Amino acid sequence: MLTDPIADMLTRIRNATRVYKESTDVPASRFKEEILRILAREGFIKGYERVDVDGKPYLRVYLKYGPRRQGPDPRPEQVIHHIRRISKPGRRVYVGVKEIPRVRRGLGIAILSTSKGVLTDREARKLGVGGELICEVW
Amino acid sequence: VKELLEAGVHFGHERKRWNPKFARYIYAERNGIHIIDLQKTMEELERTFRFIEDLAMRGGTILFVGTKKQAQDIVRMEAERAGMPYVNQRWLGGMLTNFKTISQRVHRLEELEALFASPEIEERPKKEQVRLKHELERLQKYLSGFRLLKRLPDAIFVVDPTKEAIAVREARKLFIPVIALADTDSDPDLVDYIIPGNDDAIRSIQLILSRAVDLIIQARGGVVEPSPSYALVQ
RNA sequence: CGGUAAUACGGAGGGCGCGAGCGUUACCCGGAUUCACUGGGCGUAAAGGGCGUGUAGGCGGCCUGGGGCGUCCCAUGUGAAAGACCACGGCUCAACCGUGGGGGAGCGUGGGAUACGCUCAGGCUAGACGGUGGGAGAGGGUGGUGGAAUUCCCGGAGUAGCGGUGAAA
RNA sequence: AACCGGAUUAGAUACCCGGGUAGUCCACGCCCUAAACGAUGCGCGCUAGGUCUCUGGGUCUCCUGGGGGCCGAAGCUAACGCGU
């Protein structure tokens, strides 16, 4: 069936990037879309777009890396080095605005779902609202 | 004058002995074999030759390496048709890497050009005669194109990177950019400037190599004939 | 560590560390991410249940709408004093003391938000199940039947041994 | 298995030889253990390939399912290894 659609997505992304795929699908949900636009806006993915594959909605995610590196092993640096689910269906996680974590002296980000909607941590700090600590990236 | 020359018979080569990293540089799998897209061969060939120019004119050094049957002799030509060093017989471990120390063998080779024609030409305990003058053999055999290399090269040109992977790994360790004629065995990713072609067809090797040496001279004036290399073709 | 050259025992010289103390023993936290929530693991190191069926329990796909229980925000009440913390001060300093300030989860009250989780009401077909057609199989249960071989009984024929072991008995 | 003999051996409650009861076989009811081993719990998604093979389907040099094996990308592991 699938137990965590979001966590699965972060993974699909995680997995694709380490073999340096140019693209991945992930079956489509509006909540998935909302997370994607953050990655997109915050510079981790080139972007997503909707497609229908074998007749059903997916989101084609376009990944984004670094320049071919110098010595032995020229594999590019990852743009997404670390994407990680936090609030799993087993143990749901909620920070209030006072407890919103700052991922990696700011160089990171924490997608975080609120009643004002899906937000980065700074977005949500600024809007002054906590919620379900979704995951974190950097 | 390229275009159809390669399409002579020097497009596609190896079959289902591949490396899926090469999926890009392939057109189709006709009659069981892999057939490589030439449009893409050119796309790369320019960029690759354009590399050659920019460092040829700057007066660089390319180290040529070919050791397959089908290369070998065609390397000691075009390389020498360029004053550029070559490895032909067998890639010695640490040629780029232990260089200083492998060089000590050249330091000690040309001590024999000296005693070739010297007062030491028909004398000394004459069992030493042959052994010393058959020591130069091993020496002349392997370090033919290598004696010229007096400093680490600025590039290496390879004809089979999965055959010559030991050389390549040495390159990249030293950041020496890797240029290579390479087909569907080889892993592109560790070939910097790629000539996706045919590691085997003796024709192909020449069509490409000779023409690449041409730019090495064109970048210093005075190109000539179709060049002293048409093989024992039959 | 000690068995005749002991920087490890006992002593002396010297040196190190503390100092009106210095050691010892007991106990608590630490280091110990060595019960791991933060923060661990299970092929061979300790660690996958002998295998299933499915009870309670945990967990739940895509879309929409209602409710606002989880969750989040604002206000407000409570959070005694002492203590801890920051300042300034009073005993010649300090220990001790005084005055003032600052927070805070948690819970109550009123208001508000609805992305996620919950719930209610509809939808959908990618999960699951089913329909029709086709397939391989020492999967199980019951009855039945076949040839080879061993042992025994009966007959023919035939004679001094067979058997067994490293060799024998 | 046991036990009764014969050997072997310094001894030989053994290994070898000759016998031999329970048992192994069946019916019914118990027992519930094991190196009950892939020493690897179940399910689902994702992440190069090559090769051998069992069993389907298809346009039948190949493709496409479901099994059984080996080598091996990325990665993992203390290592050995594991690696659709």
Side-chain angles (χ1 to χ4, degrees):
Chain A
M1 159 192 69
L2 214 43
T3 39
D4 193 351
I6 276 74
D8 159 82
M9 167 166 91
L10 319 182
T11 295
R12 296 204 171 207
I13 282 143
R14 210 187 307 93
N15 286 338
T17 65
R18 269 73 165 86
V19 313
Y20 296 102
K21 214 143 283 269
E22 189 190 40
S23 168
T24 321
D25 306 356
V26 18
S29 87
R30 253 179 124 268
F31 179 18
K32 284 181 217 192
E33 273 202 87
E34 284 311 324
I35 302 163
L36 280 171
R37 293 183 38 209
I38 307 285
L39 283 322
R41 150 161 73 266
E42 280 296 319
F44 291 113
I45 69 167
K46 278 203 200 303
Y48 69 103
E49 76 163 347
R50 295 102 149 277
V51 342
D52 284 38
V53 87
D54 225 321
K56 279 84 191 296
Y58 282 70
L59 307 167
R60 202 152 276 152
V61 181
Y62 291 92
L63 291 327
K64 184 177 191 308
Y65 311 88
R68 184 169 197 283
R69 287 205 333 275
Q70 269 298 85
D73 181 56
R75 272 132 82 248
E77 175 153 14
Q78 223 69 211
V79 148
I80 299 186
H81 315 57
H82 173 198
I83 164 165
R84 184 157 105 97
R85 221 251 136 88
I86 296 313
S87 192
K88 323 180 178 101
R91 207 237 279 233
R92 245 78 212 216
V93 169
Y94 310 91
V95 282
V97 92
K98 316 230 47 47
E99 347 167 43
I100 303 180
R102 52 205 177 203
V103 185
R104 204 155 194 81
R105 260 42 139 87
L107 322 183
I109 160 209
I111 297 95
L112 157 52
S113 158
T114 70
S115 45
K116 286 181 164 75
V118 183
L119 295 150
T120 69
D121 49 309
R122 301 150 298 92
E123 282 190 269
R125 213 170 310 212
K126 182 191 80 214
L127 270 298
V129 281
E132 180 159 323
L133 213 228
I134 281 310
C135 78
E136 62 183 30
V137 205
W138 54 268
Chain B
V1 203
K2 355 285 160 178
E3 176 52 41
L4 91 165
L5 297 209
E6 350 74 327
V9 256
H10 329 91
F11 44 41
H13 191 245
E14 256 107 347
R15 156 190 284 177
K16 326 307 289 287
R17 191 196 225 89
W18 74 330
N19 183 347
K21 255 102 295 168
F22 224 90
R24 32 209 291 250
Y25 303 157
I26 289 185
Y27 197 80
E29 192 233 86
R30 289 209 207 287
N31 292 272
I33 346 181
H34 276 303
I35 287 89
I36 128 185
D37 193 337
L38 307 106
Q39 158 233 339
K40 281 150 213 164
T41 300
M42 290 226 62
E43 290 195 19
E44 282 287 341
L45 237 166
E46 48 190 36
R47 161 184 157 79
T48 314
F49 275 20
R50 192 172 312 147
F51 176 72
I52 312 301
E53 275 192 334
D54 186 24
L55 110 141
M57 62 186 60
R58 286 178 177 188
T61 20
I62 313 297
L63 186 30
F64 283 80
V65 276
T67 46
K68 324 208 64 160
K69 165 266 163 91
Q70 308 114 101
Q72 268 255 321
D73 291 26
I74 206 251
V75 149
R76 74 184 317 273
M77 274 300 96
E78 307 299 326
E80 211 33 58
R81 218 253 314 204
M84 303 285 80
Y86 66 82
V87 169
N88 194 349
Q89 278 308 109
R90 198 43 48 196
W91 217 88
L92 305 204
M95 265 179 170
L96 277 31
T97 283
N98 204 348
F99 190 72
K100 168 210 157 182
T101 293
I102 266 202
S103 290
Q104 295 172 22
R105 289 268 73 62
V106 208
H107 231 238
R108 175 70 167 77
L109 162 60
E110 57 201 7
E111 303 175 19
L112 303 213
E113 265 60 27
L115 312 186
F116 170 85
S118 69
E120 300 65 18
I121 186 177
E122 302 183 359
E123 60 91 31
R124 292 299 90 228
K126 60 193 308 192
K127 63 93 192 151
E128 302 171 4
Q129 200 106 344
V130 283
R131 143 261 252 247
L132 298 176
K133 302 294 201 195
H134 221 74
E135 172 172 356
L136 196 154
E137 298 338 297
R138 110 153 278 272
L139 267 301
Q140 171 70 355
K141 189 181 180 184
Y142 306 127
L143 317 190
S144 263
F146 190 75
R147 68 208 304 179
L148 326 175
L149 245 233
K150 31 61 202 199
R151 170 200 307 281
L152 268 92
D154 311 337
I156 69 173
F157 197 101
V158 194
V159 289
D160 202 18
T162 33
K163 207 297 200 323
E164 235 56 67
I166 354 77
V168 180
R169 294 193 277 91
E170 293 223 11
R172 306 201 65 96
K173 210 149 215 310
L174 298 191
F175 301 100
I176 295 180
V178 158
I179 344 148
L181 189 256
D183 55 358
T184 42
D185 331 3
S186 307
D187 179 88
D189 294 4
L190 33 77
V191 160
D192 304 310
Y193 312 100
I194 320 155
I195 316 178
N198 202 317
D199 68 339
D200 267 356
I202 318 93
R203 309 274 256 267
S204 200
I205 303 192
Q206 178 274 346
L207 196 162
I208 298 304
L209 252 63
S210 86
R211 302 298 216 81
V213 180
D214 292 344
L215 298 209
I216 307 186
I217 355 163
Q218 161 185 312
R220 274 191 264 82
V223 190
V224 286
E225 51 186 347
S227 193
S229 101
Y230 261 81
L232 318 171
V233 175
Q234 182 70 20

